[PDB]
């Protein structure tokens, strides 16, 4: 049973705004730090059903680098109780720690995300919304994919060409996005294609242009990014291959950092 008695939740401060309402952090007293998605207008049942469907989606998954559903509260106000990633949003985390976070750590986050994404592919689940904005930090040695409902955006600057042109969404278009997500992490939480109109993004990609090597990014890691950005989706690596390749790059950097 995933139904939670409300008296066991103490609601804390607001940590962001969802499609349905504010998200709070708080504490769960079970017989635990949590996030609480709330729902402004769940007095209506059409809204309520959509909201609560987002819980069932997260219930399907069990991975150390995807946020866990703890439970739900299904009378008004209707809440979904999720695992809290204490340290918050990745982009902010990365910006604030731009000059204090080692490269091995940045690569670690890439690797961890790739294990979750390889896991989702093996569940035959296409995500569509892989971006640093949708990653969260549990601690400084652990990132996780955020809530999938909260992740829902068109994010042209992240999307694969075939997604843009023909609305093709496959694990291979997810790979393209993850490449952009990796670029973002190594760029310390800078968005891709800033100062570029969404429309010119497509033409540039067609012209052969890709996002540039982030400063201090290992060329091996950047190369791996550019393979995610093969125009032909069949020619991109599988998430399981990125996982293996990211492990070797992680271990190489750890050895360079003498650890
Ligand atoms: C960025 N995301 C959000 N989009 C919209 C509203 C809220 C969130 C954040 N959601 C979460 N956030 C956290 N941790 C967290 C965050 C933000 C701060 C803090 C903690 C402390 C703080 O100051 N800000 N832990 C769990 C969750 C979750 F997904 F399980 F519900 S996403 C799409 O869920 O990745």
Identify the residue whose tokens are 């952090």.
Answer: 25
Task: Give how far Cα 201 sits from Cα of 123, 160, 206, 209, Å.
Answer: 31, 11, 9, 9
Known catalytic residue at 129? yes
Q: Report the alpha-carbon distance of residue 118 to residue 125 in Å, rounded.
A: 10
Q: Does ligand 1 have an atom closer than 6 angstroms to the CB of 15? A: yes
Domain with CATH 1.10.510.10 in the chain: 85-254
Is 195 flagged in the annotation as binding?
Answer: no
Resolution for this experimental structure (Å): 2.2
Q: Does ligand 1 have an atom closer than 6 angstroms to the CB of 18? A: yes
Q: Residue 29 carries which DSSP code?
A: -
Is 83 flagged in the annotation as binding?
Answer: yes
Residue 37 Cα to ligand 1 middle (Å): 9
Q: How many CB atoms lie within 10 A of CB 16?
A: 14
Which residue's CA is minimally distant from atom 21 of ligand 1? 88
SS3 127: coil
Range 196-204, long-range pairs (CB < 8 A, 24+ positions): 196/157, 198/156, 198/157, 201/156, 201/157, 202/156, 202/161, 202/164, 202/165
Taking the CA of residue 84 as reference, the ligand 1 atom at the shortest distance is: 25
Closest CA to 213 of 229, 231, 196: 229
Best residue for ligand 1 mutational test, from 71, 89, 90 (most atoms within 8 Å of Cβ):
89
Domain with CATH 3.30.200.20 in the chain: 1-84
Q: Calculate the CA dihedral of residues 181, 134, 191, 175 and round it to 10 degrees.
A: 20
Contact 57, 49 (CB under 8 A): no
Backbone φ and ψ of 27, nearest 5°: -125, 135
Task: Indicate the class that CATH gives domain 85-254.
Answer: mainly alpha
Provide CATH code, domain 1-84.
3.30.200.20
Rg (CA), the chain: 19
Is 42 flagged in the annotation as binding?
Answer: no
Secondary-structure percent of the chain, ordered helix, strand, coil, rounded to 5: 45, 15, 35
* Cβ-Cβ contacts under 8 Å for 119 (sequence gap 6 or more): 61, 63, 66
| Strand 33-38 versus strand 69-73 pairing type | unpaired
Backbone φ and ψ of 28, nearest 5°: -115, 120
Which residue's CA is minimally distant from atom 32 of ligand 1? 146
Which element (helix H / strand E) includes 80? Answer: strand 79-83
Backbone φ and ψ of 70, nearest 5°: -90, -55
Taking the CA of residue 151 as reference, the ligand 1 atom at the shortest distance is: 33
Taking the CA of residue 150 as reference, the ligand 1 atom at the shortest distance is: 33
Q: Report the alpha-carbon distance of residue 71 to residue 3 in Å, rounded.
A: 6
Tokens of 186: 């190594």
């Amino acid at each position: 049973d995933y139904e939670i008695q409300r008296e066991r939740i103490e609601l804390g401060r607001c940590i962001g705004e969802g499609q349905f309402g504010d998200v709070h952090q708080g504490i769960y007293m079970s017989p635990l730090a949590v996030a609480i998605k709330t729902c402004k207008n769940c007095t209506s049942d059409s809204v309520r059903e959509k909201f609560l469907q987002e819980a069932l989606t997260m219930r399907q998954f069990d991975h150390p680098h995807i946020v866990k559903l703890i439970g739900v509260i299904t009378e008004n106000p209707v809440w979904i109780i999720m695992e809290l990633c204490t340290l918050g949003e990745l982009r902010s985390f990365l910006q604030v720690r731009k000059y204090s976070l080692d490269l091995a750590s940045l690569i670690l986050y890439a690797y961890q995300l790739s294990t979750a994404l390889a896991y989702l592919e093996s569940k035959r689940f296409v995500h569509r919304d892989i971006a640093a904005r949708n990653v969260l930090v549990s601690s400084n040695d652990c990132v996780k994919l955020g809530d999938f409902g909260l992740s829902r955006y068109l994010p042209i600057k992240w999307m694969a060409p075939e997604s843009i042109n023909f609305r093709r969404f496959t694990s291979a278009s997810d790979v393209w996005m993850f490449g952009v997500c990796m670029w973002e992490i190594l760029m310390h939480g800078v968005k891709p294609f800033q100062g570029v109109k969404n429309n010119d993004v497509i033409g540039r990609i067609e012209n052969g242009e890709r996002l540039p090597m982030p400063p201090n990014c290992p060329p091996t890691l950047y190369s791996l990014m550019t393979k995610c950005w093969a125009y032909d989706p069949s020619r991109r690596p599988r998430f399981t291959e990125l996982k293996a390749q990211l492990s070797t790059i992680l271990e190489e950097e750890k050895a360079q950092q003498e650890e």
